[PDB]
Amino acid sequence: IMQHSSGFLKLVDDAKSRIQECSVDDIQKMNETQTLDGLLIDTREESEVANGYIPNAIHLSKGIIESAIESAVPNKNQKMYFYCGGGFRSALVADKLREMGYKNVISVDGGWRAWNAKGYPTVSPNQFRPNEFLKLVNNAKTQIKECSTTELYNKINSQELDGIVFDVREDSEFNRFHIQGATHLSKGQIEVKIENLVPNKQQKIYLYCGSGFRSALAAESLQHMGYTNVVSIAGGIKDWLANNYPVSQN
């Protein structure tokens, strides 16, 4: 039960005179039918969104949204739906973004209170899993060969390395540190560059990333190109560091 004060609500009433609102029903119907046609933006505090949020939502708090929106959503025509606890703070957000030139903004009347008053589905932050990414990764792992960090490190340390090692992380990740002697070939660029770099498609190639996941996807892709001896390092450089294996910076 909120006890909103008169001066706050005067600001809210003024904002609501200028911005478009929709119902929680509109959001729920678009969610259920997979027809949501804008960004759905939770403007509540970090401590509020930790207790659950509306499906398909992203977080940009009212406190930071003006300072962040032009970098995060440069397109002034982008359709955006805002909600907060009760439909009042989100009206102020939509009106400020309208003032900045984002006119395709909608505030969700009633907000989180109305959403839960109708019993609509919610999600916890702890519940989030990148399910489709992990499905793609498991799809790749079924098709490829993998090798542990211990097996690779033991080969390197024993001067029995039997393949080329590529770090398929981003520039910034590789630059901070990498497995010593690894060659940087980002997953973004690997299919473009591999045939010029490694024309022998039977050459043994080890790929690693942060976790074993991006490298598995990259290895599947190289197999589609006819590379027959690609190996992904299970657990990636995270598992490598967990085993206290060493890393190097250029």
209 in catalytic set: no
Residue 169 binds to its own copies (criterion: CB under 8 A): yes
Pairing of strands 205-208, 105-108: unpaired
Query: Is the CB of 17 or the CB of 196 nearer to its own copies?
Result: 196
Which residue has tokens 């027809």? 35
Give, as ranges, the residues between 63 and 122 that touch its own copies (CB under 8 A): 63-64, 66-67, 69-78, 88-89, 92, 96, 99-101
Among 29, 58, 151, 248, binds its own copies (CB under 8 A): 58
DSSP secondary structure letter of residue 3: -
Among 34, 158, 244, 249, binds its own copies (CB under 8 A): 34
| DSSP-assigned letters across all residues of 61-104 | -TTTHHHHHHHH---TT--EEEE-SSSSHHHHHHHHHHHTT--S
**Identified catalytic residue from 22, 84, 147, 209:** 84
Residue 22 binds to its own copies (criterion: CB under 8 A): no
Residue 141 binds to its own copies (criterion: CB under 8 A): no
Separation between Cα atoms, residue 15 and residue 18, nearest integer Å: 6
Q: Is 250 annotated as a binding residue?
A: yes
Residue 238 binds to its own copies (criterion: CB under 8 A): no
Query: Is the CB of 98 or the CB of 204 nearer to its own copies?
Result: 98
Q: Which stretch binds its own copies (CB under 8 A): 143-151, 155-163, 220-228, 237-245?
A: 220-228
Per-residue tokens: 189:
């660029």
Which residue has tokens 């190289």? 222
Phi, psi of 143, rounded to the nearest 5 degrees: -95, -15
